[PDB]
Short mmCIF file of C-alpha atoms and ligand atoms in Angstrom, two decimals:
data_model
loop_
_atom_site.label_atom_id
_atom_site.label_comp_id
_atom_site.label_asym_id
_atom_site.label_seq_id
_atom_site.Cartn_x
_atom_site.Cartn_y
_atom_site.Cartn_z
CA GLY A 1 6.09 -28.06 13.00
CA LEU A 2 6.16 -27.31 16.80
CA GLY A 3 9.39 -26.30 18.59
CA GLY A 4 10.92 -28.96 20.88
CA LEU A 5 8.63 -31.68 19.50
CA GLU A 6 8.11 -33.88 16.42
CA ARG A 7 5.72 -36.25 14.68
CA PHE A 8 7.07 -39.85 14.53
CA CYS A 9 5.96 -43.44 13.87
CA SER A 10 5.05 -44.96 17.22
CA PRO A 11 5.45 -48.80 16.88
CA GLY A 12 1.97 -50.36 17.18
CA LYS A 13 0.36 -46.90 17.71
CA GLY A 14 0.57 -45.37 14.20
CA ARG A 15 1.74 -41.75 14.27
CA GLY A 16 2.56 -40.00 17.54
CA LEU A 17 4.18 -36.95 19.17
CA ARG A 18 7.79 -37.15 20.48
CA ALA A 19 9.74 -34.72 22.73
CA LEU A 20 13.06 -33.33 21.43
CA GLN A 21 13.79 -31.43 24.65
CA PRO A 22 13.03 -31.88 28.39
CA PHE A 23 9.64 -30.74 29.78
CA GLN A 24 9.08 -30.21 33.51
CA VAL A 25 5.74 -30.70 35.39
CA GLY A 26 3.47 -27.72 34.51
CA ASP A 27 5.40 -26.68 31.36
CA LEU A 28 3.32 -25.77 28.27
CA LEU A 29 4.46 -28.06 25.40
CA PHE A 30 2.23 -26.29 22.86
CA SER A 31 -1.09 -24.58 22.13
CA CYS A 32 -3.44 -25.37 19.27
CA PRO A 33 -6.19 -23.00 18.00
CA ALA A 34 -9.48 -24.78 17.14
CA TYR A 35 -9.66 -25.81 13.48
CA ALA A 36 -13.49 -26.10 13.77
CA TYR A 37 -15.62 -25.74 16.95
CA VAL A 38 -19.16 -25.45 18.15
CA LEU A 39 -20.73 -24.05 21.38
CA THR A 40 -23.19 -26.65 22.89
CA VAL A 41 -26.91 -25.68 22.61
CA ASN A 42 -27.48 -25.59 26.45
CA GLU A 43 -24.60 -23.10 26.87
CA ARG A 44 -26.09 -20.51 24.40
CA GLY A 45 -26.43 -17.17 26.21
CA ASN A 46 -23.74 -18.10 28.82
CA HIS A 47 -20.65 -18.02 26.54
CA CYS A 48 -19.72 -16.09 23.41
CA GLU A 49 -20.31 -18.24 20.30
CA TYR A 50 -17.04 -17.00 18.66
CA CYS A 51 -14.41 -16.92 21.50
CA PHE A 52 -16.18 -18.98 24.34
CA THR A 53 -15.79 -16.10 26.91
CA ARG A 54 -18.11 -16.72 29.90
CA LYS A 55 -19.69 -13.27 30.53
CA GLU A 56 -23.00 -11.66 31.60
CA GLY A 57 -24.63 -9.24 29.08
CA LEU A 58 -23.83 -10.99 25.77
CA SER A 59 -25.34 -9.51 22.52
CA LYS A 60 -28.07 -11.72 20.91
CA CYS A 61 -28.05 -12.36 17.09
CA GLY A 62 -31.08 -10.34 15.94
CA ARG A 63 -31.90 -12.74 13.09
CA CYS A 64 -32.05 -16.15 14.86
CA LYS A 65 -32.02 -14.95 18.56
CA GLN A 66 -30.09 -18.18 19.32
CA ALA A 67 -26.43 -17.03 19.06
CA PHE A 68 -24.77 -14.79 21.69
CA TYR A 69 -21.62 -12.65 21.29
CA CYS A 70 -19.22 -10.39 23.31
CA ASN A 71 -19.75 -7.58 20.77
CA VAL A 72 -20.23 -6.87 17.00
CA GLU A 73 -16.63 -8.07 16.26
CA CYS A 74 -17.14 -11.57 17.78
CA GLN A 75 -20.50 -11.62 15.84
CA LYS A 76 -18.91 -10.73 12.40
CA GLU A 77 -15.97 -13.14 12.96
CA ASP A 78 -18.38 -16.06 13.71
CA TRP A 79 -20.70 -15.34 10.70
CA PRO A 80 -18.82 -17.64 8.16
CA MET A 81 -19.70 -20.50 10.61
CA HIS A 82 -22.94 -19.11 12.16
CA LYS A 83 -24.42 -18.63 8.59
CA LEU A 84 -24.80 -22.50 8.41
CA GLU A 85 -27.35 -22.43 11.31
CA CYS A 86 -28.83 -18.85 11.57
CA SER A 87 -31.66 -18.91 8.97
CA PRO A 88 -32.02 -22.81 9.16
CA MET A 89 -32.84 -22.57 12.94
CA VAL A 90 -35.75 -20.18 12.36
CA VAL A 91 -37.03 -21.92 9.14
CA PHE A 92 -36.91 -25.52 10.61
CA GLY A 93 -38.06 -24.03 13.97
CA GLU A 94 -38.88 -26.76 16.53
CA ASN A 95 -37.76 -29.39 13.94
CA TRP A 96 -34.13 -28.07 14.07
CA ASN A 97 -32.26 -30.77 16.06
CA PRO A 98 -28.93 -31.95 14.38
CA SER A 99 -26.54 -33.74 16.82
CA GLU A 100 -23.44 -31.82 18.07
CA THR A 101 -21.32 -34.21 15.88
CA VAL A 102 -23.33 -33.13 12.78
CA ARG A 103 -23.05 -29.38 13.79
CA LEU A 104 -19.22 -29.82 14.06
CA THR A 105 -18.83 -31.85 10.80
CA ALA A 106 -20.76 -29.11 8.88
CA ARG A 107 -18.18 -26.52 10.11
CA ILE A 108 -15.25 -28.80 9.06
CA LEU A 109 -16.78 -29.01 5.52
CA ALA A 110 -17.32 -25.19 5.53
CA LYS A 111 -13.70 -24.66 6.74
CA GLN A 112 -12.37 -26.99 3.95
CA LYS A 113 -14.20 -24.89 1.32
CA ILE A 114 -13.09 -21.51 2.73
CA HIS A 115 -9.55 -22.50 3.72
CA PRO A 116 -8.38 -25.56 1.68
CA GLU A 117 -4.69 -24.90 2.60
CA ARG A 118 -2.96 -26.20 5.78
CA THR A 119 -3.99 -24.08 8.83
CA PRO A 120 -1.90 -23.02 11.96
CA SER A 121 -3.81 -25.83 13.80
CA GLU A 122 -2.28 -28.42 11.42
CA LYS A 123 1.49 -27.88 11.94
CA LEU A 124 2.04 -31.69 12.48
CA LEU A 125 -1.25 -33.51 11.68
CA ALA A 126 -3.72 -32.44 9.01
CA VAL A 127 -7.55 -33.01 9.18
CA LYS A 128 -7.41 -34.89 5.81
CA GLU A 129 -4.71 -37.31 7.25
CA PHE A 130 -6.89 -38.27 10.32
CA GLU A 131 -7.25 -41.95 11.24
CA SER A 132 -10.84 -43.14 10.60
CA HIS A 133 -10.87 -46.93 11.41
CA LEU A 134 -13.29 -47.19 8.43
CA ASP A 135 -12.35 -50.91 7.92
CA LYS A 136 -13.18 -51.69 11.64
CA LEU A 137 -16.76 -50.25 11.59
CA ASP A 138 -19.48 -52.78 12.55
CA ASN A 139 -23.20 -52.63 11.49
CA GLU A 140 -24.21 -50.64 14.62
CA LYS A 141 -21.53 -47.93 13.96
CA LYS A 142 -22.15 -47.72 10.18
CA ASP A 143 -25.89 -47.21 11.03
CA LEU A 144 -25.02 -44.40 13.47
CA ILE A 145 -22.77 -42.72 10.85
CA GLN A 146 -25.58 -43.08 8.22
CA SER A 147 -28.01 -41.35 10.66
CA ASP A 148 -25.41 -38.49 10.98
CA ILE A 149 -24.99 -38.30 7.14
CA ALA A 150 -28.79 -38.08 6.68
CA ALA A 151 -28.97 -35.26 9.29
CA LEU A 152 -26.04 -33.42 7.60
CA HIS A 153 -27.90 -33.43 4.22
CA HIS A 154 -31.23 -32.63 6.00
CA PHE A 155 -30.02 -29.49 7.83
CA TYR A 156 -26.87 -28.20 6.01
CA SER A 157 -27.51 -28.48 2.23
CA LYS A 158 -27.82 -24.65 1.79
CA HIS A 159 -24.09 -23.68 1.72
CA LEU A 160 -22.31 -27.03 1.52
CA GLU A 161 -21.40 -29.09 -1.58
CA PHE A 162 -21.22 -32.62 -0.26
CA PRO A 163 -18.77 -35.35 -1.36
CA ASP A 164 -20.14 -38.91 -2.01
CA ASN A 165 -21.51 -41.11 0.88
CA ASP A 166 -18.19 -43.03 1.15
CA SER A 167 -16.19 -39.80 1.72
CA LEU A 168 -18.73 -38.76 4.42
CA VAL A 169 -18.56 -42.11 6.31
CA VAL A 170 -14.70 -41.62 6.31
CA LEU A 171 -15.21 -38.01 7.56
CA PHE A 172 -17.65 -38.90 10.39
CA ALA A 173 -15.40 -41.82 11.50
CA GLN A 174 -12.38 -39.38 11.57
CA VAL A 175 -14.45 -36.93 13.73
CA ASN A 176 -15.35 -39.81 16.12
CA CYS A 177 -11.65 -40.81 16.34
CA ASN A 178 -10.20 -37.31 16.62
CA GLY A 179 -12.87 -34.89 17.97
CA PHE A 180 -12.64 -33.17 21.37
CA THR A 181 -15.31 -32.00 23.81
CA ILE A 182 -14.49 -28.76 25.64
CA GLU A 183 -15.34 -28.74 29.41
CA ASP A 184 -15.23 -25.89 31.91
CA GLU A 185 -13.40 -25.74 35.34
CA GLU A 186 -16.15 -28.00 36.77
CA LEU A 187 -15.85 -30.45 33.78
CA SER A 188 -19.28 -29.29 32.58
CA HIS A 189 -19.79 -29.66 28.75
CA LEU A 190 -19.26 -26.44 26.74
CA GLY A 191 -18.93 -27.69 23.19
CA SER A 192 -17.06 -29.78 20.62
CA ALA A 193 -14.00 -29.03 18.50
CA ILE A 194 -11.23 -30.15 16.12
CA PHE A 195 -7.62 -29.72 17.38
CA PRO A 196 -5.52 -31.51 14.71
CA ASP A 197 -2.07 -31.22 16.34
CA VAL A 198 -3.60 -32.21 19.72
CA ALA A 199 -5.17 -35.29 18.00
CA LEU A 200 -1.61 -36.45 17.09
CA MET A 201 -1.01 -37.56 20.71
CA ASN A 202 -1.55 -41.22 21.59
CA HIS A 203 -3.26 -42.62 24.72
CA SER A 204 -1.91 -43.75 28.08
CA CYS A 205 -3.67 -44.55 31.38
CA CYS A 206 -0.62 -42.93 33.07
CA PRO A 207 -0.39 -39.83 30.84
CA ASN A 208 2.53 -37.41 30.91
CA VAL A 209 0.39 -34.47 29.62
CA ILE A 210 -3.08 -32.96 30.20
CA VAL A 211 -5.22 -31.00 27.72
CA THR A 212 -7.07 -27.88 29.00
CA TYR A 213 -8.93 -25.07 27.21
CA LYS A 214 -8.49 -21.28 27.25
CA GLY A 215 -11.67 -20.29 25.40
CA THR A 216 -11.36 -22.14 22.05
CA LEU A 217 -7.56 -22.62 22.44
CA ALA A 218 -6.34 -26.12 23.49
CA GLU A 219 -3.26 -26.12 25.79
CA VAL A 220 -1.01 -29.11 26.45
CA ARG A 221 0.92 -29.25 29.76
CA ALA A 222 3.24 -31.81 31.35
CA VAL A 223 1.93 -33.65 34.45
CA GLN A 224 5.14 -35.78 34.55
CA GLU A 225 8.73 -34.97 33.56
CA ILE A 226 9.24 -35.62 29.82
CA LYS A 227 12.75 -36.30 28.47
CA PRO A 228 14.02 -36.12 24.80
CA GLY A 229 13.05 -39.21 22.79
CA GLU A 230 10.01 -39.93 25.03
CA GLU A 231 6.54 -40.18 23.45
CA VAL A 232 4.02 -37.65 24.75
CA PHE A 233 0.79 -39.33 25.98
CA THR A 234 -2.56 -37.94 27.05
CA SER A 235 -5.55 -39.89 28.49
CA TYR A 236 -8.55 -40.34 26.13
CA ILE A 237 -10.85 -41.55 28.90
CA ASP A 238 -11.97 -41.35 32.55
CA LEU A 239 -9.19 -43.03 34.58
CA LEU A 240 -11.36 -43.87 37.64
CA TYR A 241 -12.37 -47.31 36.34
CA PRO A 242 -10.45 -50.65 36.48
CA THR A 243 -8.36 -51.97 33.50
CA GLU A 244 -11.12 -54.08 31.83
CA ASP A 245 -13.63 -51.14 31.90
CA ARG A 246 -11.00 -48.68 30.47
CA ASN A 247 -10.05 -51.06 27.59
CA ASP A 248 -13.74 -51.86 26.84
CA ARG A 249 -14.29 -48.07 26.35
CA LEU A 250 -10.96 -47.72 24.41
CA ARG A 251 -11.82 -50.66 22.08
CA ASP A 252 -15.39 -49.40 21.55
CA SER A 253 -14.70 -45.69 20.91
CA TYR A 254 -11.05 -45.81 19.68
CA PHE A 255 -10.59 -49.37 18.29
CA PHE A 256 -7.47 -50.26 20.32
CA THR A 257 -6.34 -52.00 23.51
CA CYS A 258 -3.94 -50.06 25.79
CA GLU A 259 -0.70 -51.72 27.00
CA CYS A 260 0.52 -48.93 29.34
CA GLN A 261 2.09 -49.69 32.77
CA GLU A 262 -1.31 -49.36 34.47
CA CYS A 263 -3.07 -51.82 32.08
CA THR A 264 -0.10 -54.31 32.20
CA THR A 265 0.46 -54.24 35.99
CA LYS A 266 -3.29 -53.59 36.89
CA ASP A 267 -1.89 -52.11 40.20
CA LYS A 268 -4.92 -49.92 41.02
CA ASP A 269 -7.55 -52.60 40.09
CA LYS A 270 -7.68 -54.18 43.62
CA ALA A 271 -8.49 -50.91 45.53
CA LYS A 272 -10.76 -49.65 42.64
CA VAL A 273 -12.99 -52.76 43.13
CA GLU A 274 -12.44 -52.92 46.95
CA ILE A 275 -14.48 -55.59 48.72
CA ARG A 276 -15.95 -55.35 52.27
CA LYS A 277 -13.65 -57.21 54.76
CA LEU A 278 -16.18 -59.30 56.76
CA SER A 279 -16.80 -62.65 58.63
CA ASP A 280 -17.19 -65.18 55.74
CA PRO A 281 -15.79 -62.91 52.94
CA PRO A 282 -17.80 -62.62 49.67
CA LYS A 283 -17.04 -65.46 47.21
CA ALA A 284 -15.37 -64.79 43.78
CA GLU A 285 -18.75 -65.57 42.09
CA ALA A 286 -20.52 -63.05 44.44
CA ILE A 287 -17.90 -60.37 43.34
CA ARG A 288 -18.30 -61.05 39.54
CA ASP A 289 -22.14 -60.87 40.00
CA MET A 290 -21.99 -57.49 41.87
CA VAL A 291 -19.61 -56.10 39.15
CA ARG A 292 -22.06 -57.28 36.39
CA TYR A 293 -24.92 -55.57 38.37
CA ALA A 294 -22.79 -52.37 38.83
CA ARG A 295 -22.05 -52.00 35.07
CA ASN A 296 -25.77 -52.59 34.31
CA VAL A 297 -27.04 -49.88 36.80
CA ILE A 298 -24.52 -47.41 35.29
CA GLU A 299 -26.12 -48.04 31.85
CA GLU A 300 -29.67 -48.06 33.36
CA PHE A 301 -29.09 -44.64 35.08
CA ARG A 302 -27.51 -43.13 31.92
CA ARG A 303 -30.76 -43.96 29.99
CA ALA A 304 -33.02 -42.97 32.97
CA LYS A 305 -31.72 -39.35 33.36
CA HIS A 306 -33.31 -38.40 29.97
CA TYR A 307 -36.90 -39.17 31.10
CA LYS A 308 -37.07 -39.99 34.91
CA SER A 309 -37.87 -37.40 37.69
CA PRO A 310 -34.99 -36.11 39.99
CA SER A 311 -36.43 -38.11 42.96
CA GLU A 312 -36.58 -41.28 40.75
CA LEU A 313 -32.95 -40.69 39.70
CA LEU A 314 -31.79 -40.33 43.37
CA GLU A 315 -33.85 -43.49 44.18
CA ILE A 316 -31.77 -45.51 41.63
CA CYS A 317 -28.49 -44.13 43.18
CA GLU A 318 -29.57 -44.83 46.79
CA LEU A 319 -30.95 -48.35 46.05
CA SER A 320 -28.01 -49.51 43.84
CA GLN A 321 -25.54 -48.23 46.54
CA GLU A 322 -27.54 -50.18 49.18
CA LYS A 323 -27.40 -53.44 47.14
CA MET A 324 -23.67 -52.91 46.25
CA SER A 325 -22.58 -52.01 49.87
CA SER A 326 -23.23 -55.67 50.91
CA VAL A 327 -20.14 -56.71 48.81
CA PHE A 328 -18.44 -53.33 47.94
CA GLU A 329 -16.57 -50.82 50.16
CA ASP A 330 -17.53 -47.07 49.88
CA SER A 331 -14.15 -46.29 48.19
CA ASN A 332 -15.09 -48.84 45.41
CA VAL A 333 -15.39 -47.02 42.01
CA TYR A 334 -18.93 -48.46 41.37
CA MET A 335 -20.18 -46.91 44.66
CA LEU A 336 -18.31 -43.66 43.68
CA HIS A 337 -20.02 -43.49 40.24
CA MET A 338 -23.51 -43.69 41.81
CA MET A 339 -22.55 -41.11 44.52
CA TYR A 340 -21.19 -38.76 41.76
CA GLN A 341 -24.45 -39.23 39.74
CA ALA A 342 -26.48 -38.55 42.95
CA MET A 343 -24.35 -35.40 43.61
CA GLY A 344 -25.20 -34.15 40.07
CA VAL A 345 -28.96 -34.66 40.69
CA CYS A 346 -28.65 -32.61 43.97
CA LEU A 347 -26.72 -29.79 42.19
CA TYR A 348 -29.45 -29.56 39.49
CA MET A 349 -32.15 -29.57 42.24
CA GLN A 350 -30.12 -26.78 43.99
CA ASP A 351 -30.00 -29.04 47.11
CA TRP A 352 -26.53 -27.70 48.08
CA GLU A 353 -26.51 -29.64 51.40
CA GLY A 354 -27.25 -32.95 49.63
CA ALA A 355 -24.57 -32.25 46.96
CA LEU A 356 -22.02 -31.43 49.71
CA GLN A 357 -22.58 -34.69 51.69
CA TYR A 358 -22.04 -36.76 48.47
CA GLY A 359 -18.93 -34.76 47.46
CA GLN A 360 -17.39 -35.23 50.94
CA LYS A 361 -17.62 -39.08 50.51
CA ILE A 362 -16.15 -38.89 46.97
CA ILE A 363 -13.02 -36.66 47.32
CA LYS A 364 -10.65 -38.95 49.38
CA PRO A 365 -11.18 -42.13 47.18
CA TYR A 366 -10.94 -39.90 44.02
CA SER A 367 -7.40 -38.73 45.07
CA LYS A 368 -6.45 -42.39 45.73
CA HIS A 369 -7.75 -43.73 42.32
CA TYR A 370 -6.79 -40.88 39.90
CA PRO A 371 -3.19 -39.88 38.86
CA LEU A 372 -1.18 -37.19 40.80
CA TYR A 373 -2.56 -34.31 38.65
CA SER A 374 -6.12 -34.97 37.56
CA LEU A 375 -8.87 -32.70 36.17
CA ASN A 376 -11.49 -34.93 37.84
CA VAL A 377 -9.98 -34.50 41.33
CA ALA A 378 -9.33 -30.71 40.68
CA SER A 379 -13.01 -30.25 39.61
CA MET A 380 -14.30 -32.23 42.63
CA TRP A 381 -12.25 -29.99 45.02
CA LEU A 382 -13.62 -26.90 43.19
CA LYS A 383 -17.29 -28.13 43.43
CA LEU A 384 -16.72 -28.93 47.16
CA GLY A 385 -15.14 -25.48 47.78
CA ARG A 386 -17.98 -23.58 46.06
CA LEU A 387 -20.58 -25.67 48.03
CA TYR A 388 -18.82 -24.85 51.37
CA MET A 389 -18.48 -21.13 50.36
CA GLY A 390 -22.16 -21.01 49.32
CA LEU A 391 -23.28 -22.67 52.62
CA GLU A 392 -21.24 -20.09 54.70
CA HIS A 393 -18.49 -22.66 55.63
CA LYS A 394 -15.65 -20.27 54.54
CA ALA A 395 -12.57 -21.99 56.16
CA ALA A 396 -13.51 -25.45 54.68
CA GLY A 397 -14.29 -23.63 51.39
CA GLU A 398 -10.95 -21.76 51.18
CA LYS A 399 -9.12 -25.06 51.94
CA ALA A 400 -10.98 -26.94 49.12
CA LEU A 401 -10.58 -23.99 46.66
CA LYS A 402 -6.78 -23.93 47.31
CA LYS A 403 -6.56 -27.75 46.81
CA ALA A 404 -8.24 -27.24 43.38
CA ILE A 405 -5.82 -24.32 42.50
CA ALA A 406 -2.73 -26.48 43.36
CA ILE A 407 -3.70 -29.05 40.64
CA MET A 408 -4.99 -26.36 38.19
CA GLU A 409 -1.72 -24.38 38.31
CA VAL A 410 0.03 -27.50 36.87
CA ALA A 411 -2.76 -28.47 34.38
CA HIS A 412 -4.25 -25.06 33.28
CA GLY A 413 -1.13 -22.92 33.95
CA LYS A 414 -0.62 -20.42 36.84
CA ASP A 415 -2.04 -17.46 34.80
CA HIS A 416 -5.26 -19.27 33.75
CA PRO A 417 -8.45 -17.10 33.91
CA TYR A 418 -10.23 -19.97 35.84
CA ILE A 419 -7.62 -19.60 38.67
CA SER A 420 -7.98 -15.73 38.72
CA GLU A 421 -11.76 -16.33 39.11
CA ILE A 422 -11.35 -18.88 42.01
CA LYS A 423 -8.88 -16.48 43.72
CA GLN A 424 -11.55 -13.69 43.38
CA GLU A 425 -14.02 -16.16 45.05
CA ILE A 426 -11.53 -16.62 47.99
CA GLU A 427 -11.12 -12.74 48.18
CA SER A 428 -14.92 -11.95 48.19
CA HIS A 429 -15.89 -14.51 50.93
O1 6TM B 501 -13.02 -35.09 24.23
C1 6TM B 501 -13.42 -36.25 24.34
N1 6TM B 501 -12.75 -37.25 24.92
C2 6TM B 501 -11.40 -37.05 25.40
C3 6TM B 501 -10.38 -37.60 24.44
C4 6TM B 501 -10.56 -37.06 23.04
N2 6TM B 501 -9.39 -37.36 22.19
C5 6TM B 501 -9.41 -36.63 20.90
C6 6TM B 501 -8.31 -37.28 20.13
C7 6TM B 501 -8.25 -38.70 20.65
C8 6TM B 501 -9.20 -38.79 21.83
C9 6TM B 501 -14.71 -36.59 23.72
C10 6TM B 501 -14.92 -36.16 22.40
C11 6TM B 501 -16.21 -36.49 21.78
C12 6TM B 501 -16.55 -36.09 20.41
C13 6TM B 501 -16.18 -34.82 20.01
C14 6TM B 501 -16.44 -34.36 18.75
C15 6TM B 501 -17.14 -35.15 17.87
C16 6TM B 501 -17.54 -36.43 18.22
C17 6TM B 501 -17.26 -36.91 19.50
N3 6TM B 501 -17.66 -38.22 19.91
C18 6TM B 501 -16.61 -39.21 19.81
C19 6TM B 501 -17.01 -40.47 20.56
N4 6TM B 501 -18.26 -41.03 20.03
C20 6TM B 501 -18.66 -42.23 20.83
C21 6TM B 501 -19.29 -43.39 20.06
C22 6TM B 501 -18.69 -43.71 18.73
C23 6TM B 501 -17.36 -44.07 18.60
C24 6TM B 501 -16.82 -44.39 17.37
C25 6TM B 501 -17.64 -44.43 16.26
CL1 6TM B 501 -16.98 -44.81 14.71
C26 6TM B 501 -18.97 -44.08 16.38
CL2 6TM B 501 -20.01 -44.07 15.01
C27 6TM B 501 -19.50 -43.74 17.61
C28 6TM B 501 -19.32 -40.01 20.07
C29 6TM B 501 -18.93 -38.71 19.36
N5 6TM B 501 -17.16 -37.21 22.45
C30 6TM B 501 -16.87 -37.58 23.70
N6 6TM B 501 -17.67 -38.28 24.52
N7 6TM B 501 -17.04 -38.49 25.73
C31 6TM B 501 -15.85 -37.90 25.64
C32 6TM B 501 -15.70 -37.31 24.37
C1 SAM B 502 -6.51 -39.36 17.81
S1 SAM B 502 -5.70 -40.67 17.04
C2 SAM B 502 -4.02 -40.52 17.71
C3 SAM B 502 -2.97 -40.38 16.61
C4 SAM B 502 -2.93 -41.67 15.75
N1 SAM B 502 -1.96 -42.62 16.34
C5 SAM B 502 -2.64 -41.35 14.23
O1 SAM B 502 -1.63 -41.88 13.71
O2 SAM B 502 -3.44 -40.59 13.64
C6 SAM B 502 -6.35 -42.06 18.02
C7 SAM B 502 -5.98 -43.43 17.45
O3 SAM B 502 -4.59 -43.70 17.70
C8 SAM B 502 -4.39 -45.06 18.05
N2 SAM B 502 -3.86 -45.13 19.42
C9 SAM B 502 -3.83 -44.13 20.35
N3 SAM B 502 -3.29 -44.47 21.49
C10 SAM B 502 -2.92 -45.80 21.30
C11 SAM B 502 -2.28 -46.74 22.13
N4 SAM B 502 -1.85 -46.47 23.36
N5 SAM B 502 -2.08 -47.98 21.63
C12 SAM B 502 -2.49 -48.25 20.38
N6 SAM B 502 -3.10 -47.45 19.51
C13 SAM B 502 -3.28 -46.22 20.03
C14 SAM B 502 -5.74 -45.76 17.87
O4 SAM B 502 -5.78 -46.38 16.59
C15 SAM B 502 -6.72 -44.61 18.08
O5 SAM B 502 -8.01 -44.77 17.50
ZN1 ZN B 503 -16.50 -13.20 22.10
ZN1 ZN B 504 -28.28 -15.88 13.93
ZN1 ZN B 505 -3.61 -48.17 29.80
#
């Protein structure tokens, strides 16, 4: 196993990770190399397929022209995994579209055939031992898994010997329960991976650890002091939202209800759903209605970004904020979500001024709603800093870049390449 830690039976939480020694804020508890991993399609050409290094001048795979590498070594090392997609991409052509979940599951199957023995990524929890929640699956989820199984057979039958359908619904449910997405310093999606020992950790809305990535390596660092005997908890979800919203997401994606201090006390719920203080305050029924509206526009926008124009997307943000502002304060998390979505539309449109004015309204409430060390508030400071720097506002930029570094030093470690990059950005301008 891992030094200073141990696997244990967490009452009402199945298996978990327990500390056998003290850990201070910013200490690295452990690292876990990716068992299986996949670079997201939209990041091809930007990062090396094998090690996830973000570099200019990456070598293109001559066969498929859709895999990029640091050099010939990264290329040869990725071939046992790349071989699953190389020829299929050119033969299926435009028809090649398996979901990221399917791309990852294919590599797990390939890894199980090549390396059946326990890997260095499985010191405490093995891939085969993963929780699946098979018995909890409803018709909607079973249908989704069946769509994934059909795509797995459709695109990856060349090198893989598949187990029966029942073993594959168990596998896909394990991947849903235990899979990780890898994000960059701005929380932008890079890919998906399997980190078995990292999947041992249970959830808390007040976590004592944070997971970050150093290429394909997962790193676990304390964001609170951890004493011997204490369970080590990470957050599975976005902690901006009130208790009900967090537990709806936790029940839906992870089949459990959280009972952490935050969910029990609901301390942050009041400010998260802050109401405008006005002559004749809004009635309880007016609040519940606005909240119902808010959750519906979130869903509406999520669907809309796939097919609506950037001006239509901003229109939804601006109009929903207008309707909500009659009842809701600007610091209210539903206003924040729409402002964050509007900021993203500006960034894509390269409207740096527009992005900056949204970010400026988001950062103070973010700090108030998120825990002391948070990747979401670090990433927002970083975005804000780069916007200021880009728009020639160097003093405001250096200040925001340093605010981001202060959180990142705890979460990513002092020596993290993302911090060396940000420091080079402070140096240059
Ligand atoms: O890293 C992520 N979250 C942080 C905490 C992760 N840790 C890791 C150990 C504990 C928590 C994260 C991972 C994934 C991810 C990565 C790989 C494969 C499938 C992934 N997804 C899983 C969720 N699924 C949603 C719908 C669903 C749910 C259950 C079922 Cl059964 C079905 Cl059918 C469909 C979609 C696929 N995705 C994500 N999205 N947002 C966030 C996501
Ligand atoms: C990635 S696994 C974590 C390790 C898991 N406990 C095991 O024994 O394999 C995620 C699953 O653990 C359970 N879990 C995690 N955090 C929990 C919590 N705070 N309360 C209850 N169950 C939790 C849920 O069943 C969830 O789907
Ligand atoms: Zn590389
Ligand atoms: Zn290729
Ligand atoms: Zn909680």
